[PDB]
Structure formats: C-alpha cells, structure tokens
Design a binder for this molecule. Structure first.
Ligand SMILES: Nc1ncnc2c1ncn2[C@@H]1O[C@H](COP(=O)(O)OP(=O)(O)O)[C@@H](O)[C@H]1O
Ligand SMILES: Nc1ncnc2c1ncn2[C@@H]1O[C@H](COP(=O)(O)OP(=O)(O)O)[C@@H](O)[C@H]1O
Ligand SMILES: NCCC[C@H](N)C(=O)O
Ligand SMILES: NCCC[C@H](N)C(=O)O
Ligand SMILES: [Cl-]
Ligand SMILES: [K+]
Ligand SMILES: [K+]
Ligand SMILES: [K+]
Ligand SMILES: [K+]
Ligand SMILES: [Mn+2]
Ligand SMILES: [Mn+2]
Lengths: 342, 342
C-alpha cells in the first residue's frame, strides 16, 4: 500500500482505515536514472524524466529520454549523486536511482541496486545493451575492458508510455497514484518530444482525437495552469466544457467554456454528457481522498465510453503537444535509429 | 396585505407570520381597460397592455397604449366582456377593468366602477378627456349627446413608466409585486413601441446604458425565455455574466456567458462586481419567499450602485427593444399628437 495525507484530519482519517512517514514532494518532477558501476567507474545508462509528477508511480508514468524540461545543470547534479551513491553502496552491475526535483533542488526517492524495469527501454533508446554490459561487469569484465564507458544521448526522443488494466475491473476508480497498476508499456520515437509522445500515446491505444469538445475539471492547485491548457485546446479547434470552479477560473482569464453540471448540481451533468458522446477529451485532476471518491464518476464514465482522459495537468500538456504531431507521418527502424547514434 | 404562496409548506409558513384564496395566474399578461358607460352604450376609453406580468401590481407596471403584443382577437373579448359588465353593473360615467390573459384565455381580475389612476394617461394618449366626458355623462348628458361614441386608436405608441421611492428607503428590497409602491409616473410617445418605451424609460430616470456588461440571473420559469434576451443583449454589444443555473441554460443554447459566483459561493461574487461598477445592466428574476430573501442583496446592491435593473423578463425584453431606439431623436408636442388622430 501507499497513501497521501493532506491534513491533520486526513491523518487520523487514514489512521482509522489504516509506519514510515515522509513529506510528499508536491509539484515535483520525477526522474529515473539507470546506471552501471564496475567498482572503477559509473556509467549513466539513461536519465528519464517522467511526464507525471512525483506521486504517480514511475511504473505508471510516461517518460522521456532525454529529459524534455530538465536543465542540464540539474541533470548534472543527478548524475553526480548517482555516482556518489554507486561507489558508496558498492554496486557491481545495474542500479537505478529515483529523484524528485522540486524548486531546483534534487531530492532522493530511492535506490534500486539491481536491474530496473526501465532497463529495456533505455537499451532500446540508446543502442546500449545494458543488461549485457552489466552482466559482463558482474561476471568480471570492467566497463573500460568492454569499451562502454560513455553515456549515450540519442539524437532523437524516446518516449515511454504505459497501459493500465482498469478496463478489466470497471469497479475500480481509474486514477493514477503512488501505487503501480500498469501491465505494460510501449515506446514512441520522434524527432521531437511532441512526435515521440504522440507515437507513444497512440501505441498505448489512446482514443485521443484532434477535434471535438474537451471537458476541463481541475483541482484548485491546477486552476492556474489550466488556463494555458485551455488556450492550447482552443487554438487546436476544440470546444470546451467545464465545471463550476474551473469555469470561474477560465472566465476570469478571458475563457468562457460551456458550463457543465456536476452530478449533484443537476442536468444535464458530465456523466450524461459523457454517456452521450459529447466529449472527445477529458482533463480531470483531483486532490484528496474525499474529492477523489466524489469525482470518481468522471473517470469511470470516461473509461466506459472510451474517451481519452488525462488525470494530471502534466499529462494534459503532453497530450496537447502531441496534437501538433502526426504519429503516422514517419516511421523509423531500430537499426536506423541505432545507426544515427554518433 | 397580499402575498403569493406556492406550496403546502409555503402556505402554513405564511399563516405563521400571518381571508381570500385565489388561483395564481402564472406567466400571464395583465391588461387595463378604462371606459365610459351611460346605460345606453359603452365607450372604450383605452386598452393598456402591462409590460410586467400579472403578479406585479398595475400601479407599478409599465404599460402600453395600444397593446404591443396582444392580439386583436383577444382585445375584442375583453372589449366584449367590459361592456357586459358596464351594463350589468349599471355603470354610469367611468369604469375600469383588469384582465389577465393566460393561454389565450381572458380571466377577470377586478372591476372598478369609478375613475382609475390610468385615466389621465389614456386621456393624454388618445386626446379624449375621459374625465369630463364621464362627468357630462354623470350629469345627464349621454355619450351620444356629447358626440363621443367611438373608441379612438392612436397612430403612435404611448408608454407609461413608473418611478419608485426605494431610494428613499434603503432597508427595503427594491422589488416589485402585488402591492403598489410607486409614487409617480412618466410618459413616452413614439412611432414604435421601442421608441415609446425608450422615452418612458429615460423619463423615469433610468441609468440604463447602451453598452458594457450585463448580469443575468433568472428564475427557473424564466430560464427558457432568457436565451432570447441574452441573444438580444449580445447583438447590442454587451458582455455577459451569469450565475450558475442561468449560465447552464445559456450554454445549452450556444451562449457562454462569463460565470459568476453568488455571494455564498466565492470571490469575487456578484456583490463585489456590482459594487465595482462592473455592470451597466442587471436582469434578475426570482420566485419564492426564500429565493427572494436570498437574492435581496442583488437588488439592493444594484439600486445602491445605480445600475439599471429589471426584475421581470418582460421588463428586460422591453429594455432590450428600447436599445434599438433613441429617445432623443424626435420630439413631438401634445398638440401635434392630437392632431394626428382620426
Ligand atoms: N517523498 C515523496 N514525494 C513525492 N512522491 C513520492 C515520495 N515518495 C514516493 N513518492 C512516489 O511514490 C512512488 C513509489 O515510491 P517508491 O519509494 O519508489 O516505492 P516502490 O518501491 O514501489 O518503487 C514514486 O515512484 C513516487 O511517485
Ligand atoms: N388571480 C390573480 N392572478 C395573478 N395576478 C393577480 C391576481 N389577482 C391580482 N393579481 C395581481 O395583483 C394586483 C392586485 O390585484 P387587485 O385585486 O387588482 O388589487 P388592488 O385592490 O390593489 O387594485 C393586480 O394588479 C395583479 O398584478
Ligand atoms: N502514463 C499514465 C496513463 C495516463 C492516463 N491517461 C491518465 O492520465 O490517468
Ligand atoms: N415598471 C417598474 C419599474 C421597473 C424596475 N426596473 C424593475 O424591473 O423592478
Ligand atoms: Cl470490477
Ligand atoms: K511520476
Ligand atoms: K523499489
Ligand atoms: K402587471
Ligand atoms: K381595487
Ligand atoms: Mn520506486
Ligand atoms: Mn387593481
């Protein structure tokens, strides 16, 4: 298990239902780092920046190699910490290090001193067979002896997206969190981030469309960045609907979405609107046990009626960017990809 | 003392703070008819169609001479009805009748076998000193004898608007009802109902503007018709704001107003905006002792801030028609007016 308590009252509440305690790094970028240590040196296999923020398990987060928003400066910091950790822990073969970047500061989430699930994706994206290398290291052949001593940074973007099994258990609230529920993943290769993400989104079987009406229903903390996402959808040709508070926020910024009723507010409401095929896209972010349990019907209908939905603002942005790409425009083979690697 | 009750609950509730019970003719057109009978015949002095529906006391209703929406067919029955009354009642001199028109049916409200407060208006509009005629009649000189026998229909529209003393008494909810509160009245003469109403409106000291932002917040029964008014305002160049329910309705119709918060909903709310002179027009309609008490702050606020406001949808429609006209375009003397009559 894993849960995120927001306030004192939430604490006891949880406790009632319910021990390590940890400050939840809100509004942080999650990063994964795969590396090999031979006792002599440390090789960075790959720095992957997650699309979904810290708080959504990495196994359920889409990610990019290379990072699409992290500064080189901060990545360099993560690279140095990985090395510090590698040598100190006595790693010999693979390791994976997870961070959270909040306010230009690097925080450590955890160290997995072994092969991590991102190893295949990184190998594919970079042309380096990490498990083959780390296995030789473990058996006794150094990285220097193998001629694998420099971190590779591909000339293209590699985006990994996941597939979740919620459709198999419709009674479950289809939302992301600190616990992993995904079964698999796909990879998208693009000239740009938008291009890789688009191919990854499509590969994951997304029903995302390039037109239609979008439903925006976000949490307080997102209300501010929503405006921009709303502008983006607008410039794309989407029409918009929104719930009360979200509408309030848009209006104030000059955006007037068409108001939609909350299930308790009356009719018609979102469920009806979703059930009746009015939307081609949904962005609904929530925060707090109670608020979640309450918004459960949005997510559930969206999944039922096959409407593409994002449950993170970060995901919404990414989806928005891909709107600008065409995943069927161009294709590349793995051999070509690896040949482009200088 | 007169009040309107809506349900069982409502009735006792009254009874508490609290006898004739009368069906309430909801969504009906109120009409006033002034006439003279001499036992021999009946002369129709004037048929005035109120702008505010039945439920808004005659003395506080703006009215039109001649009717501005009413059918000839309907007028004729009223006309017939009056007569019948004039005789049965044995009326000799002046009389006034008030009808209500629901679903093309004419209901009888009250008959006043004397001179009504409308007489001077009618007299000025039509050119006939109803007062003297009736006087001559009362003193033995028949309509026939006098040479006044056929109902006069003017060639221009005459609109009567009233003035309320609410500003002298602020603790008062400046809202209309079955009880008269006005002190005086003004007259507007025009080629079109719109032009007459525009003059009457200006004449009544209205602060209505020809631009800015409107605030719409109407009751359920009105929610339907409001769309058309919204559209009209829209055509005139106004920007719109609406409270939730109203914003929904509008949206369902293609109109996305800017969503605003009621007072208990958040900040800023309507009071805040009114207070900041955010609006140039407000349309607020309400049903229920509760909805009314609850909306009180809207009206007091508007009154206090000098924003023109309508408390009836019919009123709003008229305000809107008037936006088409220009009260200062043409001036006409009473002498001239009377000269045009055939
Ligand atoms: N302090 C924290 N702040 C923010 N997010 C965190 C924090 N600790 C854990 N998480 C989130 O929870 C997920 C799982 O935590 P982790 O320690 O890596 O568990 P696991 O062993 O299942 O991999 C992370 O991938 C991350 O999104
Ligand atoms: N049955 C009714 N249905 C709807 N409105 C009514 C009804 N009876 C009266 N009214 C409204 O209340 C007002 C007052 O009624 P009325 O009997 O004419 O009172 P008053 O003696 O003050 O002139 C009317 O001018 C009208 O707007
Ligand atoms: N990478 C996780 C899958 C994203 C899913 N559309 C969601 O936003 O919940
Ligand atoms: N004819 C009565 C005055 C109208 C006022 N604006 C109101 O609608 O309450
Ligand atoms: Cl299930
Ligand atoms: K994450
Ligand atoms: K772990
Ligand atoms: K009336
Ligand atoms: K009376
Ligand atoms: Mn982990
Ligand atoms: Mn009356």
């Amino acid at each position: 298990a894993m849960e995120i308590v927001y306030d004192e009252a939430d604490l006891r509440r949880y406790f009632q239902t319910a021990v390590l305690l940890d400050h939840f790094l809100d509004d942080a970028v999650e990063v994964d780092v795969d590396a090999i240590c031979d006792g002599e040196m440390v090789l960075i296999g790959g720095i992957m920046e997650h699309i979904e923020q810290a708080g959504v398990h990495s196994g359920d987060s889409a990610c990019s190699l290379p990072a699409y928003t992290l500064s080189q400066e901060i990545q360099d910091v993560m690279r140095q910490q990985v090395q510090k950790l590698a040598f100190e822990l006595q790693v010999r073969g693979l390791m994976n290090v997870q961070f959270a970047v909040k306010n230009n500061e690097v925080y450590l989430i955890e160290v997995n001193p072994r092969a991590a699930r991102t190893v295949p994706f990184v190998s594919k994206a970079t042309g380096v067979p990490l498990a083959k290398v780390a296995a030789r290291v473990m058996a006794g052949k150094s990285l220097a002896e193998q001629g694998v001593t420099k971190e590779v940074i591909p000339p293209y973007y590699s985006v990994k997206e996941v597939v979740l099994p919620f459709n198999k258990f419709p009674g479950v609230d289809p939302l992301l969190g600190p616990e992993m529920r995904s079964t698999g993943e796909v990879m998208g290769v693009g000239r740009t981030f938008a291009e890789a993400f688009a191919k990854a989104q499509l590969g994951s079987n997304s029903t995302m469309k390039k037109h239609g009406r979008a439903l925006l229903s976000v949490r307080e903390g997102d209300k501010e960045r929503v405006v921009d996402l709303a502008a983006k959808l607008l410039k794309q040709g989407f029409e918009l609907d929104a719930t009360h508070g979200t509408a309030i926020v848009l209006g104030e910024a000059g955006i007037n979405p068409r108001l939609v009723n909350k299930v308790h507010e009356g009719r018609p409401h979102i469920q009806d609107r979703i059930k009746n095929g009015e939307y081609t896209y949904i962005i609904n972010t929530t925060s707090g046990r109670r608020a979640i349990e309450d918004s459960r019907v949005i997510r559930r209908s969206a999944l039922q009626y096959k409407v593409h939905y994002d449950t993170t603002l970060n995901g919404g942005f990414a989806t928005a960017m891909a709107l600008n790409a065409d995943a069927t425009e161009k294709v590349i083979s793995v051999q070509e990809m690896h040949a482009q690697i200088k």
